[PDB]
Amino acid sequence: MFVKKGDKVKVITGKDKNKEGVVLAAFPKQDKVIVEGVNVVKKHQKPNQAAPQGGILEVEAPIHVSNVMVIDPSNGEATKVAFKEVDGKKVRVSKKTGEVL
RNA sequence: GGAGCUGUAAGUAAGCUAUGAUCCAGAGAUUUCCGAAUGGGGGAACCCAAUAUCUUUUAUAGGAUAUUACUUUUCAGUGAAUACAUAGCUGAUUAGAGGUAGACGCAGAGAACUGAAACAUCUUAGUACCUGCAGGAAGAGAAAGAAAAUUCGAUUCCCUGAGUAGCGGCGAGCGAAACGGGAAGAGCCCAAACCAACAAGCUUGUUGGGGUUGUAGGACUCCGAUAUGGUAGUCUGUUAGUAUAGUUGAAGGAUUUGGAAAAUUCCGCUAAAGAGGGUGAAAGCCCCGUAGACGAAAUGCUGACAACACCUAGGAGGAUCCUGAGUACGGCGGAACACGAGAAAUUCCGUCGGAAUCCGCGGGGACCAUCCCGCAAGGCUAAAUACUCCCUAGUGACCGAUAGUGAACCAGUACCGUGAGGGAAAGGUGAAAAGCACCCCGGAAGGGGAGUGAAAUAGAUCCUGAAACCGUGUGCCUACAACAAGUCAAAGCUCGUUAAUGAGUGAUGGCGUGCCUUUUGUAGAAUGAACCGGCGAGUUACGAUUGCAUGCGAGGUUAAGUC
RNA sequence: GGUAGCGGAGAAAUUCCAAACGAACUUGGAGAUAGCUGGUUCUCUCCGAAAUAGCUUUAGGGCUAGCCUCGGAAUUGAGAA
RNA sequence: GGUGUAGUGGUAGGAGAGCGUUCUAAGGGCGUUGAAGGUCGAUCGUGAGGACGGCUGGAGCGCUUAGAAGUGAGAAUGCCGGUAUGAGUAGCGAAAGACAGGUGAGAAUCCUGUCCACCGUAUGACUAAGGUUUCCUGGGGAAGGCUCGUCCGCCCAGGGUUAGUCGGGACCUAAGCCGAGGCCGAUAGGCGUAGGCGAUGGACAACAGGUUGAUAUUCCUGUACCAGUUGUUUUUGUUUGA
RNA sequence: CUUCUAGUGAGAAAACAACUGCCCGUACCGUAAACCGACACAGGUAGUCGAGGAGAGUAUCCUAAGGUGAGCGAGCGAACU
RNA sequence: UGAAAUUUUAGUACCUGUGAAGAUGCAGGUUACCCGCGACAGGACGGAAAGACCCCAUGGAGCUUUACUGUAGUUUGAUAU
Ligand SMILES: [K+]
Ligand SMILES: [K+]
Ligand SMILES: [K+]
Ligand SMILES: [K+]
Ligand SMILES: [K+]
Ligand SMILES: [K+]
Ligand SMILES: [K+]
Ligand SMILES: [K+]
Ligand SMILES: [K+]
Ligand SMILES: [K+]
Ligand SMILES: [K+]
Ligand SMILES: [K+]
Ligand SMILES: [K+]
Ligand SMILES: [K+]
Ligand SMILES: [K+]
Ligand SMILES: [K+]
Ligand SMILES: [K+]
Ligand SMILES: [K+]
Ligand SMILES: [K+]
Ligand SMILES: [K+]
Ligand SMILES: [K+]
Ligand SMILES: [K+]
Ligand SMILES: [K+]
Ligand SMILES: [K+]
Ligand SMILES: [K+]
Ligand SMILES: [K+]
Ligand SMILES: [K+]
Ligand SMILES: [K+]
Ligand SMILES: [K+]
Ligand SMILES: [K+]
Ligand SMILES: [K+]
Ligand SMILES: [K+]
Ligand SMILES: [Mg+2]
Ligand SMILES: [Mg+2]
Ligand SMILES: [Mg+2]
Ligand SMILES: [Mg+2]
Ligand SMILES: [Mg+2]
Ligand SMILES: [Mg+2]
Ligand SMILES: [Mg+2]
Ligand SMILES: [Mg+2]
Ligand SMILES: [Mg+2]
Ligand SMILES: [Mg+2]
Ligand SMILES: [Mg+2]
Ligand SMILES: [Mg+2]
Ligand SMILES: [Mg+2]
Ligand SMILES: [Mg+2]
Ligand SMILES: [Mg+2]
Ligand SMILES: [Mg+2]
Ligand SMILES: [Mg+2]
Ligand SMILES: [Mg+2]
Ligand SMILES: [Mg+2]
Ligand SMILES: [Mg+2]
Ligand SMILES: [Mg+2]
Ligand SMILES: [Mg+2]
Ligand SMILES: [Mg+2]
Ligand SMILES: [Mg+2]
Ligand SMILES: [Mg+2]
Ligand SMILES: [Mg+2]
Ligand SMILES: [Mg+2]
Ligand SMILES: [Mg+2]
Ligand SMILES: [Mg+2]
Ligand SMILES: [Mg+2]
Ligand SMILES: [Mg+2]
Ligand SMILES: [Mg+2]
Ligand SMILES: [Mg+2]
Ligand SMILES: [Mg+2]
Ligand SMILES: [Mg+2]
Ligand SMILES: [Mg+2]
Ligand SMILES: [Mg+2]
Ligand SMILES: [Mg+2]
Ligand SMILES: [Mg+2]
């Protein structure tokens, strides 16, 4: 996928539109990704999970990769990603600015 | 290729990964046992060996490795009745077995139902089935031809000839070929005569040279040339390309509704990319892609180049020699030719008889003569043609879960049968499991809250949720009535609609024997339907003919085929 | 263990051959053939029969004619009462 | 378009004109401000049929023109599915059970006890075939059990089959079968010699007791036997040679 | 298996000690609810043992060892079968 | 605990008559308050089996013979070996 673990991304669709967070986990096979503080769900968990209350836990659920855009670290704004080889190494490049990664 | 990964498949647990994992492509290694199965056996996936080497034990037992089936080819050694020998036996060597792709090809053998309105000739049909052999194609193929326009010049396939010529209990039916137009195109090798070498027993076998034909050719004898061209040869190299992974690949933000925007509105932007797919609803500009550009370490495949290899001669004379024998052909009996013995050619098989050979031979649909055409009894040969089990990329006025493959799902499965064999049913929560923590009744199941969700009457028998069938509640009617159940008339009561000279129910009165099929005639005591739902029957191809329509009109029109 | 369907076996009954044997079972030819029975799905408008003759291995089938329907041509109008 | 005249039952069947369904093309549209579909309504047309509104539903679908058909079902003792009727009816598959206690949410049906009753050339004890885990232990009550079930030959989880001597193989053969060469035959193959396979037969060394929840001539105890190897000792033969 | 020689032969035999001896089956049901009958089916299923009194007896009745009370019951005590 | 055959929908009387000639359903008259339970079997030409008897089809099959046409075998001759 064009987005990678640890990236800073902006949500461009969904209830969490315009939010921005770091990518916590990536699932290329599902073409999905998890962004901290994005698409949080209340989950009714029995206490069988080493938590002696079970409770209603809060966890981020994956969102489709197409619904996020990588944040330009140099500019702080979301942008599309091109691929340019720099000094013999292929890297991602911001189409808005040209900055790497 | 660059960040996750340890399948479906969650879960725990333990781990791997920028020292580049998982993943993708080429090559390679390992690849238990059964299975042609092949050391022997055997009720497949098991059992028991011999030989040689190694290994465990003090040693026997035990373990590993290698070889050991049958037949064919070749060689060698041994070796009977029997003397020589052969046969047998031993060893080595060589190449076969079996399966497929339910397809396509060739051949052996080869039905019946059916049609003929019966049936035997005939037709179904040389089809179905069985068997052998194959190749990527096969088969055919280089004239003892087609013709008689005078010519053509291997074969195959297509259009046409033509439903014609013909065949046929002259019935039912079967049914050509040549000419013409096209796809593709290619020609070559022996036997023989003759010469040389070799061995034996002047000829007689092997090898080599020579020769490959019908306007006759070759040998042979003279001359002159030792060239000119070609190939349907090679794991020979070089080169180019291509197949099998990949890389790159433009352009959008807000606004309104909404859980969610791609939808609406407003302004923009890209296009060699507005094919398509996905994304929380319908996206040219979010993602995967698309147009375009680029890319191969390794192995295949193709084409070119070279290399090697192999074919390649002209003219003149005939005196003689050669030019495919148990063959051609004939009788008899069958069969194939559209042609069923018919006047019957031509071709093939079985049996018997049985030629000529260049002044020769065969054919031109009995046969003879003339003329014309050709030269059998030897072999090989690419392309055009046939088919798709498979792999890749696509396409569809093709199906959309009773459809479409039997099989969208762990299907040739479950199940049935001794066996061959027969053969199902079964797709959909939600955008996302966020798959209902906690509480209450209950032993649980299952519910009621409370929560998740936009929606839970989307709660896993989960999208939608029809009808039959069942049940609850009730507006009206019903216990003196004989009812194909309705229809026409109608009081009463109840209710207020697509606002219509309304709706529901209905005491009571009149009339009135279902639907379908098949019948002269059916309410029929003739037939069929238990009910509901789904599925379920004049279609297509090629021809004939008529109507209608269009174009052209004494003209009309192309078929195959090429782009 | 042997005998297999154009067959086997039969102290013989058409008796048995995997719960139906005057010719087993399965697959294929195959969608056998059926002058026979059954079924054949929407609507309205115009018109509207026949159950007869002849022949038929023909009689509950078929063919021609007769009767119906649609289109067309032409007439010194030929039809009906 | 108007007036007039006439006509307008109908099976087989002929002619004409239309409705509706799926899909294709073009144009023009409609849809999370809710499509298709479902359901209700007292709506429109001459007919097949067409709208409109409410509710349900949640993503596709009309309209006009033309085109193509797997294009219309009520019947085929049609096929498949579902559900009725008979009907809370037949049946619940040879026979003896009773009570007390226990367990349990729950007991005629499970466990224990007592009495009673049944079989006893069997309904007892061994075994071959066959079945193939049904055996034991601990749980369970969804489904199966013709009732019930706390229970089971059911379901879940673990566990269980110990051989020189028993049966079979490393032993033998009968019938039958296979069959090197071979004989025969359109193909395929048929038959068959040597040689093998093949028991239901022949040959062959261990028995008693004990032990577990489940195995026992298998494990253990005791005492044996059969075949063989190494070693020690004592014998005796070394080629007129055991 | 026992003999006979043919062949083969330098080592054999006895006692004792120690040691070796492979593969498959082994559960369970088995005149049945576990097999064949679609069923937890009144049928079929080879062989062995199969006691006592009376008795010829494995007949018959009642019993031993041992096993079992049959997988719907409770009432009532009509017709009819 | 829990089926089945059957089943066009049924609010499912009698007599006489009528009718495809043997009516629960049609005509006339008569009878009959509504719903059941236990019994019987006259009818629903009751259910079950597309009658086997009879006829028909230019159907099938098995069998017979001095039906027709063939044919395996058997035999005889010519001919090849
Ligand atoms: K084998
Ligand atoms: K194929
Ligand atoms: K025939
Ligand atoms: K006929
Ligand atoms: K060829
Ligand atoms: K023709
Ligand atoms: K005829
Ligand atoms: K030459
Ligand atoms: K998106
Ligand atoms: K798109
Ligand atoms: K290459
Ligand atoms: K002929
Ligand atoms: K010629
Ligand atoms: K829903
Ligand atoms: K009601
Ligand atoms: K009335
Ligand atoms: K009848
Ligand atoms: K008999
Ligand atoms: K039906
Ligand atoms: K029922
Ligand atoms: K009922
Ligand atoms: K238990
Ligand atoms: K034995
Ligand atoms: K045992
Ligand atoms: K006695
Ligand atoms: K006794
Ligand atoms: K019981
Ligand atoms: K009683
Ligand atoms: K009685
Ligand atoms: K009648
Ligand atoms: K009766
Ligand atoms: K018969
Ligand atoms: Mg083997
Ligand atoms: Mg016929
Ligand atoms: Mg090949
Ligand atoms: Mg792009
Ligand atoms: Mg936009
Ligand atoms: Mg012929
Ligand atoms: Mg001849
Ligand atoms: Mg000739
Ligand atoms: Mg002539
Ligand atoms: Mg000539
Ligand atoms: Mg070719
Ligand atoms: Mg569906
Ligand atoms: Mg299907
Ligand atoms: Mg709903
Ligand atoms: Mg639903
Ligand atoms: Mg009265
Ligand atoms: Mg009253
Ligand atoms: Mg009649
Ligand atoms: Mg009926
Ligand atoms: Mg008789
Ligand atoms: Mg029988
Ligand atoms: Mg046929
Ligand atoms: Mg639709
Ligand atoms: Mg249809
Ligand atoms: Mg129906
Ligand atoms: Mg009753
Ligand atoms: Mg009982
Ligand atoms: Mg007795
Ligand atoms: Mg048990
Ligand atoms: Mg237990
Ligand atoms: Mg029960
Ligand atoms: Mg043999
Ligand atoms: Mg035991
Ligand atoms: Mg035992
Ligand atoms: Mg009368
Ligand atoms: Mg009467
Ligand atoms: Mg009436
Ligand atoms: Mg009857
Ligand atoms: Mg009949």
Side-chain angles (χ1 to χ4, degrees):
Chain A
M1 309 187 303
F2 69 97
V3 71
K4 193 193 309 188
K5 183 185 180 62
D7 298 335
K8 184 68 177 299
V9 306
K10 167 184 176 180
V11 179
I12 56 172
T13 67
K15 190 69 170 56
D16 301 322
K17 182 176 182 185
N18 303 325
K19 275 191 187 180
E20 306 179 5
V22 175
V23 169
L24 301 177
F27 314 91
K29 293 178 184 178
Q30 312 158 235
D31 284 318
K32 289 184 173 182
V33 61
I34 296 172
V35 181
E36 69 86 10
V38 174
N39 181 234
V40 172
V41 305
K42 291 162 281 188
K43 182 158 46 172
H44 302 89
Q45 288 291 1
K46 293 284 194 176
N48 64 338
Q49 288 297 339
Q53 201 168 5
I56 299 181
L57 182 61
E58 299 286 31
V59 292
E60 300 77 353
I63 64 179
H64 198 274
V65 82
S66 97
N67 299 340
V68 300
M69 186 177 295
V70 308
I71 288 299
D72 190 328
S74 293
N75 184 25
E77 291 184 8
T79 181
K80 279 161 284 187
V81 174
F83 284 89
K84 317 295 184 179
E85 183 127 348
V86 172
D87 297 4
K89 176 56 177 61
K90 177 176 169 183
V91 296
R92 298 183 298 171
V93 177
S94 162
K95 287 184 177 178
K96 279 187 178 182
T97 68
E99 151 62 335
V100 298
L101 290 309

